[PDB]
Design a protein around this ligand. Sequence first.
Ligand SMILES: COC(=O)CN([C@H]1Cc2cc(-c3ccccc3)ccc2N(Cc2cncn2C)C1)S(=O)(=O)c1cn(C)cn1
Ligand SMILES: CC(C)=CCC/C(C)=C/CC/C(C)=C/CONC(=O)CP(=O)(O)O
Ligand SMILES: OC[C@H]1O[C@@](CO)(O[C@H]2O[C@H](CO)[C@@H](O)[C@H](O)[C@H]2O)[C@@H](O)[C@@H]1O
Ligand SMILES: [Zn+2]
Lengths: 315, 410
Amino acid sequence: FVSLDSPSYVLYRDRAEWADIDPVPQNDGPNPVVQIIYSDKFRDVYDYFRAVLQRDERSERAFKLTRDAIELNAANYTVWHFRRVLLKSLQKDLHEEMNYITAIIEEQPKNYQVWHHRRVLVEWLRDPSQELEFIADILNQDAKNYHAWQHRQWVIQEFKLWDNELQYVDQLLKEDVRNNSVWNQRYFVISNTTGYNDRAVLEREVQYTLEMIKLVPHNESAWNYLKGILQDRGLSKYPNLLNQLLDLQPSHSSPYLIAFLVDIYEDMLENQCDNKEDILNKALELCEILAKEKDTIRKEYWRYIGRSLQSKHST
Amino acid sequence: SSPVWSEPLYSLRPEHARERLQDDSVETVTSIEQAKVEEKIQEVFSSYKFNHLVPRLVLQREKHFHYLKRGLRQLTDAYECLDASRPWLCYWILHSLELLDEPIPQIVATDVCQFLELCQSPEGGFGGGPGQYPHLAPTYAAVNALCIIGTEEAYDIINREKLLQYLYSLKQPDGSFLMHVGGEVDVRSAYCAASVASLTNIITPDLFEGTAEWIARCQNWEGGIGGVPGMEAHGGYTFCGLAALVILKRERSLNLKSLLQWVTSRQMRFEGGFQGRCNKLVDGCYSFWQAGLLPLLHRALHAQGDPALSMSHWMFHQQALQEYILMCCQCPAGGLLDKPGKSRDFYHTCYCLSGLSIAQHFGSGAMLHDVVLGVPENALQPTHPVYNIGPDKVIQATTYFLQKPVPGFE
Ligand SMILES: COC(=O)CN([C@H]1Cc2cc(-c3ccccc3)ccc2N(Cc2cncn2C)C1)S(=O)(=O)c1cn(C)cn1
Ligand SMILES: CC(C)=CCC/C(C)=C/CC/C(C)=C/CONC(=O)CP(=O)(O)O
Ligand SMILES: OC[C@H]1O[C@@](CO)(O[C@H]2O[C@H](CO)[C@@H](O)[C@H](O)[C@H]2O)[C@@H](O)[C@@H]1O
Ligand SMILES: [Zn+2]
């Protein structure tokens, strides 16, 4: 009706249509702590909100009041919950409510309550039709918004909207190949569709990732995805990979490559490789290089890995 | 060696420059943002070096104390956005004071107890302010604040019978918890529930059925833990997940190898602080959420008889973290912050100090080893890595409540 910052906004205490209900002040006790000295506008809205909540007044006036309470503090989960009680009680048009939450999220996309509210609406409507495009708009403004990604995963899984997501992932990796949220989405799509047990799919993914590593060798996310898609079967189960990285070592001896070699050696030793003593010596040499020169921030981790290898494989 | 008035720093070594970002000549939004932070931080590090003279670093305790003491009474309307988070303000402030070894006056303590009583819901749990619905986040904060106070008055505030009923009212068949009635599920709720239920001795056999398994489903391909199954690994949710599993004695439900490798990877080679997820920016609050995972992992691995564990250090760079916090995260007006250029706030004050204390204090069994960078006065009180209140406060509360029955359950 009238927005909180509109020139014609009137305090609730001055509204004739609210005259019949007494506001309920917040009791902070006689000796308050962490006491927020609210603006007049804030206190006015929340005094009337406390009144409608106390009375459990399920009215159109209470519904409009929640919009103002939300503008004042969109992290107020009590107000959001009451608004949903009213949406149901008053049989409000949920498509109009979807337009409202769309606007609100655009303004405040880093907020748990607004995303949860949207999910409840989509659940109630069983209508995911605006979701992928809307989320894509939020992600256009911040490609790593955690709530946006989480909501996208929910919509896709709940409504089985898998068909175009790998293409979307590819587009965002083209824009920023360092976007870890997108590598995570890549795993989410593949594991839930084809799986990684299909050896043709796994090969496609290993090639794709190695190509990304060649383009941007110090991008941690691609290294992490490579390990992530191979680790459960065991890095040592992929003998060609070791050779390929060993061929890359001299010219591209990054801490990521060197760490990946240690990870391979660790698994090899766990699986009774031939030339155990040789593999152990190479692993310990690399742990020392990482601890002392190439990855010194992780000195304590690399020293632990060295001791761990010796406790398991020395003889 | 060195005179007492100069202390060489890791971030000031000549070879530290080699740790700057290598963008491979491929610029993306990520690398551009990382480089901007690194450039600012290098300027900061340099301001602490005077050729071979490197004065000891100083935690500005008195400035932090005054800032905190003022936040405990009245706040401006700038804090309206935290009107549904008032027990958090109590917890963040009281815990910061506790770390700084600043006594809580009797009158302040009573006033805090009274206010938290007003935030307690008749249905059980605490809301974000008086008359608000209860929510597991301010429930966690209020319980922690009461245990920091640690008086019988504080303990007795908690309605334990209703608290247990409230937790039941949020519990889902898949092991997860809602954050509040009609609210969202994520791993924060499992931790909030496990924390308050263990401190107050209200755990039933039933309460956490399936919860360990659900948390394990949130561990992802990266090795850290996301907010819900499928989601990107994040330090905040990883802390919650592992701490909840430690309380439940179910840490082995996770792959601790991939978790350890992931968290240690989150320490930034140049900045010395931690990022919250791969390829994002350093932030002082991760000094707690990320680095606090290392004492938890140490305990977990030690329980398994791991013969390779250190007897003196956590598995992260304790010195570099202390350097990041002391040089980059202090506001000269008091309070601490995310990174240079950001505004102070009570949340970053709480977690930067908590992370500093973790970095200063190693303990395992009978072995204790402190590394207090800078002037000796920088030493903070220790914090418990599960609950993030003083270990003394944990013991006192748990002992008190263990004397009461689990409500309606024999
Ligand atoms: C115990 O852990 C927390 O409370 C983290 N929370 C916020 C808290 C927060 C508080 C303040 C603050 C505190 C006191 C006075 C003024 C401000 C500032 C920022 C806060 N959070 C955002 C944050 C912290 N570090 C990076 N970022 C983006 C993260 S949070 O409520 O879980 C959160 C809410 N959202 C939407 C995302 N995180
Ligand atoms: C007991 C509680 C309430 C713990 C909170 C645990 C945390 C800190 C969880 C993180 C939740 C979250 C929504 C993270 C996403 O933050 N988004 C960012 O952009 C910050 P960054 O870039 O550092 O990920
Ligand atoms: O970090 C890998 C480790 O996490 C677990 C769960 O504890 O599984 C996660 O990671 C897998 C990929 O490695 C995903 O398939 C799975 O969905 C996810 O929960 C362990 O199984 C795995 O070793
Ligand atoms: Zn932060």
